Amino acid sequence: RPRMVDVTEKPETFRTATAEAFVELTEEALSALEKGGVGKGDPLVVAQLAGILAAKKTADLIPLCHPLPLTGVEVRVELLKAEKRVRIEATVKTKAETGVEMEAMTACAVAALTVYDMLKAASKGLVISQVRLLHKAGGKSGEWRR
Amino acid sequence: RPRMVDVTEKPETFRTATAEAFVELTEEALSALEKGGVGKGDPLVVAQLAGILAAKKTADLIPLCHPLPLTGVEVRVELLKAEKRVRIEATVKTKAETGVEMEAMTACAVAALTVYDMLKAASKGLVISQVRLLHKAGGKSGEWRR
Amino acid sequence: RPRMVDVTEKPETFRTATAEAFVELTEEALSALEKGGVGKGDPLVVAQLAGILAAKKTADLIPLCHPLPLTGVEVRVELLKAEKRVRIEATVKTKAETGVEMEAMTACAVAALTVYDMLKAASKGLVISQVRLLHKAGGKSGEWRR
Amino acid sequence: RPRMVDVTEKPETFRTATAEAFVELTEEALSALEKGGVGKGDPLVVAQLAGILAAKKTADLIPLCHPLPLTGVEVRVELLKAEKRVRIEATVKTKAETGVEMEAMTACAVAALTVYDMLKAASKGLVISQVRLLHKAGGKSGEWRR
Amino acid sequence: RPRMVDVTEKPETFRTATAEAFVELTEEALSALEKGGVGKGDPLVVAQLAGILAAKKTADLIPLCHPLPLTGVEVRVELLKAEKRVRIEATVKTKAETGVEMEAMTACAVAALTVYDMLKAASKGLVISQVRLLHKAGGKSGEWRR
Amino acid sequence: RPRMVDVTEKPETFRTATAEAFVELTEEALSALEKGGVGKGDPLVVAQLAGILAAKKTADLIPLCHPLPLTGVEVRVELLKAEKRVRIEATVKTKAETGVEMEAMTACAVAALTVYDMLKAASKGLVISQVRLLHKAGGKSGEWRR
Numbered sequence A, B, C, D, E, F: 001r002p003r004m005v006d007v008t009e010k011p012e013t014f015r016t017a018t019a020e021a022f023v024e025l026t027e028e029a030l031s032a033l034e035k036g037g038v039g040k041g042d043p044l045v046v047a048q049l050a051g052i053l054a055a056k057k058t059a060d061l062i063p064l065c066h067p068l069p070l071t072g073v074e075v076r077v078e079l080l081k082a083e084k085r086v087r088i089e090a091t092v093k094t095k096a097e098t099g100v101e102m103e104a105m106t107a108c109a110v111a112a113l114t115v116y117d118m119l120k121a122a123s124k125g126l127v128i129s130q131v132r133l134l135h136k137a138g139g140k141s142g143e144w145r146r
Helices: A027-033 A043-061 A101-117 B027-033 B043-061 B101-117 C027-033 C043-061 C101-117 D027-033 D043-061 D101-117 E027-033 E043-061 E101-117 F027-033 F043-061 F101-117
Strands: A013-024 A072-080 A085-096 A127-137 B013-024 B072-080 B085-096 B127-137 C013-024 C072-080 C085-096 C127-137 D013-024 D072-080 D085-096 D127-137 E013-024 E072-080 E085-096 E127-137 F013-024 F072-080 F085-096 F127-137
Touching (some): A013 A101, A027 A043, A043 A072, A043 A101, A043 E043, A085 A101, A101 B101, A127 B101, B027 B043, B043 B085, B043 B101, B043 C043, B043 D043, B043 E043, B085 B101, C043 D043, C043 E043, C043 F043, C085 C101, C101 C127, C101 E127, D043 D072, D043 D085, D043 D101, D043 F043, D072 D101, D085 D101, D101 D127, D101 F101, D127 F101, E013 E101, E027 E043, E043 E072, E043 E101, E072 E101, E085 E101, F013 F101, F043 F072, F043 F085, F072 F101, F085 F101
Antiparallel strands (some): A013 A085, A072 A085, A127 B127, B013 B085, C013 C085, C013 C127, C127 E127, D013 D085, D013 D127, E013 E127, F013 F127, F072 F085
16 A cells, blocks of 8 residues: 655755756747747746746645655756757755655656646647656665766 | 736636656566555556646646636556556546646646656656647637647 | 546536534543633634635545535534533535535534644543534435435 | 635626735845845746735635635736835736635735745845735625725 | 644654544445445545545644654555444654644544545445544653553 | 755754734724624634744745744734734744744734735725834844844
8 A cells, every 4th residue: 555655763864856857849839938938928937936836845746755844946947949948957955864856856847837838829739758857865875867 | 927817708618638648667667567566555546646636736836827626637547568658648627718738737747756756766767758738629729639 | 547527517506515523522621621722722713714724625635526616614613511522513605516515524524633633732532523414405416414 | 703704696707806015125125126136036026926826825825715716817026116115016807706805915915925035135124015905896895996 | 822832942753643533334335345436436545545645734734733744654544344334544753843643633534534525426424433543652741542 | 047045054943033014904994803803703813823824834825935844833913902903923933944034924914914804894995014024033144133
């Protein structure tokens, strides 16, 4: 049966996690982003904040996730014109008995969903691709790198 | 500036949206899923419910999204062994002045994040790929299909 | 698999539901309630409000529950000295395609949990008993009475 | 006792509400806002989005408030240099049996709190003043104007 | 007046709490549970997860409850055929200045409410009985047992 | 770009913050408060609890705010008849790497909004004035007093 793994006996150590996500753009969507949106606000700006908010809401969205007080959240949402791609990166930090991989992953996922929300009016077919972990530190397994 | 588009004058019509997401599995992750998990519960079962819950929480996660009472939510999380892939599909329905594309997309995204959460212990490199809309009906633009 | 039953085709009708719950008191707990609490506030007052708030949060707590805009919520938390019992009753109303039995039941459950929270300092053994539905109207099954 | 007034019998009509709030700035705070902040982001931008989000969260914050699906939310956060004041205005709309005065008021209050949050590093004494309703339409009382 | 008791000066110690709840079944409800439900999913499975989620949401539901990061949550929802009863048990753990009795109690209460939600279609009269604390450790009062 | 300032390296120290807010009353509103309200419950009582709840929800409302476990929350909502004013004061405490000024400010703001909610039926023009910080301790800047 499902369970929130017990980590009460484990010590409180410094944890960090970094993830990224991408939104593939059509020419119509790119044109829209280079102008500030399509009558609704700047998608990149709104998405960046949605990511930070999402990081804090992670334990509420992921069933078995441990609720943790976050000590740091950085989110970047930038347009890569030549690649016709929007790249989202998020780094979360804390001092706990469990990692913050889910917080970083969720921040990127929701920021990507927000980019989609504000560009779907012009392109409903936009795809969110490659939500993945890039790095993490802390824990017994130690440092991990993609 | 950002804004929740005014749709007060628009009529209350039947809306529907269907999206999907994929989690690419390593052999280690697949082996884990074919046994029910790695000491934490069945990832597919927990993820399916997380998707339904996420659909209802959509307006809270997406800044400019319209809060709507949902009349239907279906989520499926199945293992595709040969493809070493987990496929998530979600269909949301309602009667409103705006669509539920975000609810379907968010349900798939969070279900995928939950699959990742429960398999990351064995494979931190698992990737969430192709969160995308498959269909939607209702609205002026009418029926849309990928 | 679990699913939020589709009721999009069903008409929007007037629904109502009434439930109740009881907290059995020890002499120590009763004595505390007859004085306004044990250094923390009036349990009956705080619990009554917790019930109203809980009714609105129902869809977030019950996985397959339909999110609905509530049009009415009444909660009563009264002390029955002779019976050494606290009786909670809640009636919820709305216009929807599904009932509000869960909203009434949840309001009573959380109000009871709040009574417990503020009296557990003196009596950790207090029991919440008989959370049950008393009545409901609306829907195909029509009127129901215990 | 407190109660969420029953309005189930009332018809679903178009409602609107507009409110405003002000943040009085010190010279130190003004100087900070004219540069984009003090190492944390643009206070006006973050506050504007916080207001929209807050409007949707209103029923969760105000105990007896009726949960309603919002059909429109507009928030503006502008700097009034000469007056050394930040003015926040918010207009909310919906179709319901109750008004959205609380949604407009809460949107302004939280946007103001966010402006404070991002400028308190330089000026902890900043004051939020005059959160007040400016207009509302719909309901039996009809149109109201300050 | 109500207040969240100040425990800032108290040390951060290991706390644990265990509670249980019961749902009394009619023959109709039992028959339904022995088949996996009545067209909506397995009540026992969905309820078990609802309990874990509820434990994390406890401070949001109980007014004066202290917000705490949980380090462990275990919930079990089993069918007791002979007794025509569903037994829910939940154990919560953490390191804090206050106990987690409310988290254990709330987890059981919401799991029970979820069992009711998915069986009320066949039996609206099902009763939730005996939500009660079984054990707790940590704190000045020390170990407690029912 | 906006960011939740990293304070992971900072030590966990005792923090405190006190804020206040005022609601200016018309004679109609004052008369209503001296009787317990206008058919909806006691505004002062409901508002006081809304403030405590709001303090716990602060990080969810303020975008860049750090999520923290609160160890103490005190809120007072009193009527000042001669001044025709309702005064709200709130003191929040915790042990963290950041302050709780936002929690104190938000508690006062929401309590004030609740007072408004329950008196707006008789006076829609009521104004919330002077939400401001009165004191705070902890942090490098040390003790601060208005």
